[PDB]
């Protein structure tokens, strides 16, 4: 576990950019890529979630993965999310994800259908046999996978060989803890960045988040907090992110983040893939105002 | 609504045969279709949950619905379950569908993600101008989906243009009721197996499930019992379902079912598409006895 | 469970009268108690849910139970729901159902407190210790309790020594088949009205219910059709429940049954007991309509 | 929400001791209160859910807030749990805490009947008008009471007049960062001892636990970590709180703490009431070593 220590930190959850007719916007996405590097951040991690993973083709995510990794490879931490309901679909991203040369795969418990614990567990191993030598990120989402894994088997997932982290998407404090507990040397990543602060606190020591993509040197700045006994310091600033994270739940988290980019001059395009509705317009006036804000904020 | 009464009845959902190497066996797939026909079943449902839709590409469901449509077309009532998370996705599954000839489309409610109840409308209207004149069948199994629709959003799915029917896998069988009442003319599904005779009670018209790939003609029993007013025969018909349904739990439904089928000289391979494992050795026995039974109850 | 067939059928969940000052109403509730019984029920099932138990003192149960037994014993048969969370209050009421010569006794599972298996079945072997020689009824109402037993569970509870049947309140009939399967003889009541005769298809061989006060005919008609096999009748007759149930649930369940019964000059004040709200005006046309509807459809 | 400061702080949620035939063993309840008193406390929560209330008579629990004030009145912060499902019952456990001097009344949202949140609102105005002049905590605990209110109710509630804090036993450091935002002067009592840390961060600031009853030092020093910036102290007081928490989940909470209160001369007999079971013999050692280590802790 302290071999992988390379790991730990704040690494937004990129953004997938798409054009208008929703395919890959690729010079978007490499300006997306230069943008987040330039916030300071400590990685990234590649077609998950927060990157609409599961409305896009296999071939769609290795070409996202490999112009992430042309342009990021040996500036910042490079983790690729792969993971997939089938393991076979898993096992040619993690395949590919080793071909572009990045620095650890990750997988979704697979989800849709309910699998047995020792079905998740020969899931990840066959995923962690196709990475060939890169260490694996759990990725743990109770709340949009359906799976509610005891402590105990979450336990048993972190220690596979081959694992080399775990991102607890979870607000339950308690056992963030105890994970930490169990496990001294473990990468754990906060998953809900509305209690960034509170997670490390309780045992995470880094976060893997959508907004990190418009306002990470805020989340750095709470790590930094935190090191220096500034709690003030650190609640101020998670008071902050929790006012953006308020306004993008209201208007749409993932197309909320790229109309802040958009706005940024980011992003060409700030859409998400049907059925994702496009922003509403009155909304608009706010979310520019948020892009402004963020802009001065910085210098 | 009343236009669309070709689509009541029994109808397996039918299991998407794979080879050895987890490829589409598509000899085995023919034989499954003509084995269901042989069953005197309504029609079959193709490519859904229990077709394991989810661990395939577009391009292999495609060539499941085609396979489907040449064996079955003007036989038997086909529909087509086109739902990915995608919109464009499942578009291009209708477009496919419509190519065929299959008689209606389906799609469950995208899922993973949350979107709002408005983008699930667009979703199934943007699909349903895919089919390009082909009804709709909406799918309900919150369950898995974890979408939670109101009887009222229910309500409304039921009546957008274009929509013939309703897959309802719920076990709440007042919203059954309450369905059925304020629409007497709808085409209802019942979707759990293990409820069929009291959904039917309840207001269903018919069913598409799992296990009537291996004994349709008990569910087409109990339709006949409760018609002729032989609650009894209805009861003990599902109580033998339903000791055949406590075996597929213990041993994994979909791979059970296709166990029972290989031993029945119908699939040549019982195996499901990895994280699901294969079979468990001590339980061959008791798969082998339940087909034996079953073939011998045919006649 | 041979021994106590004379617990089966159809017997209304009683409510509790109050006055205008929230005290028990004594003459009312003697009326309610006779209402019943000329509606041809089997029995009656006092101070439970529906009752109000548990915004009740341990003396104004008992005061209850009392006035029942005196109205009802040796007409139609007396259930005595005496649970609470204590198992010492639960013993309490019980010795007094005793003394007062009910039929049955009966116990909500503990809720609360998150209690172990092993205790509720500890707290049942208490209460059936008490109650000294007449038989229990196990209630199961997960959505209220929070107790969530398995199949295995319920199978150990209703075979402890004492336990003559279960209050089913599941919509889960699947379960309801299981538990018929594993237990042919069990005296099994339906717990939710609104899927009655769902739930006798599926097993049950009764029921327990709030809204038999104001039109038990209904559920018995229920019961006949199914015998008679019917169906068609049986549905319509659930159809119609439903329509009252929908109201109910409009306007309050409790109270709106209790606005009824007070049209019906059956009750002297239709309130329920604070934290219950009154009903509102604006539903009093639509509740006494129904009172007139009810008592039209009698003679 | 200025002027009621003075409940700020680090309260034990009391048991309630009982003797050997589980009636209330006063001398041991007063021996609790000076413990707790001498373990520095800023208060006491008297008779809620660790208190046993819920398997307590109203005359019960009056006895014990009468005996807790008689030892406490003027010595630390006095908060009668005053909660009961019934309003009447309610309010009659606030006029006695008024008579005895309690410094406020607590209750918890009504549970086991679904109630609607105008419902709850006119129960806490009920009780607040009994209270008669004393301050109102608004106590919120969805695991148990199933009372699952949204952010805009819970500012509804802590705005009604004569609330004056806020027990929120919720894991959701979100909702607790957004309550302290929009009520930056509002006391905020965080429930789940096990994120205590956490929860000050997110904004709570204070707590009312169920293991302070042996352990208050390590919270005091936990709150006094978070206000010197130690934020590695804070996060090794919360590991051992954590430690502890794991093996009273084991043993059963409230019986685990007072078998640790036994063990430490402050309990004569350890019992909860039934349905809950006596410890099991084989954890006796080990709560016995948690006892000593305390002792040995604290001096
Ligand atoms: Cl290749
Ligand atoms: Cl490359
Ligand atoms: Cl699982
Ligand atoms: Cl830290
Ligand atoms: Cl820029
Ligand atoms: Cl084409
Ligand atoms: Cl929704
Ligand atoms: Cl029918
Ligand atoms: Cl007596
Ligand atoms: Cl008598
Ligand atoms: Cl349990
Ligand atoms: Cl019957
Ligand atoms: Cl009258
Ligand atoms: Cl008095
Ligand atoms: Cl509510
Ligand atoms: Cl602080
Ligand atoms: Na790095
Ligand atoms: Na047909
Ligand atoms: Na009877
Ligand atoms: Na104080």
Chains 1, 2, 3, 4 share one sequence.
Not at 32 to 51: H, K, P
Not at 139 to 168: D, F, R
Not at 202 to 211: K, P
Request: charged residues 20%; aromatic residues 8%; proline residues 4%.
């Amino acid at each position: 576990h302290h071999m992988v220590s390379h790991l730990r930190g704040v690494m937004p959850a990129l953004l997938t950019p798409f054009d208008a007719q929703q395919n890959i916007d690729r010079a978007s996405l490499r300006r997306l890529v230069r943008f987040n590097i330039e916030q300071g951040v400590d990685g990234v991690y590649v077609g998950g979630s927060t990157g609409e993973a599961f409305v896009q083709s296999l071939s769609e995510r290795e070409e996202v993965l490999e112009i992430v990794a042309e342009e990021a490879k040996g500036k910042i931490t490079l983790i690729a999310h792969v993971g997939c309901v089938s393991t076979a679909e898993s096992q040619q991203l993690a395949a590919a994800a080793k071909r572009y040369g990045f620095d650890a795969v990750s997988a979704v418990t697979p989800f849709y259908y309910p699998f047995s614990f020792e079905e998740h567990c020969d899931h990840y191993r066959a995923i962690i046999d196709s990475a060939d030598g890169i260490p694996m990120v759990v990725y743990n989402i109770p709340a949009l996978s359906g799976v509610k894994l005891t402590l105990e088997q979450i336990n048993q997932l972190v220690t596979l060989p081959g694992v080399g982290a775990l991102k607890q998407t979870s607000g339950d404090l308690y056992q963030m803890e105890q994970i930490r507990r169990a496990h001294p040397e473990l990468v754990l990543y906060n998953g809900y960045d509305e209690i960034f602060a509170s997670g490390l606190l309780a045992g995470a020591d880094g976060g893997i988040g959508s907004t990190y993509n418009i306002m990470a040197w805020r989340y750095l700045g709470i790590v930094q907090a935190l090191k220096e006994g500034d709690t003030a310091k650190a609640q101020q600033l998670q008071h902050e992110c929790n006012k953006v994270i308020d306004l993008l739940v209201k208007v749409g988290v993932f197309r909320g983040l790229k109309t802040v980019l958009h706005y940024m001059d980011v992003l060409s395009v700030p859409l998400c893939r049907k059925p994702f509705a496009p922003v509403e317009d009155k909304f608009q006036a706010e979310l520019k105002a948020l892009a402004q804000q963020l802009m001065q904020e910085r210098g």
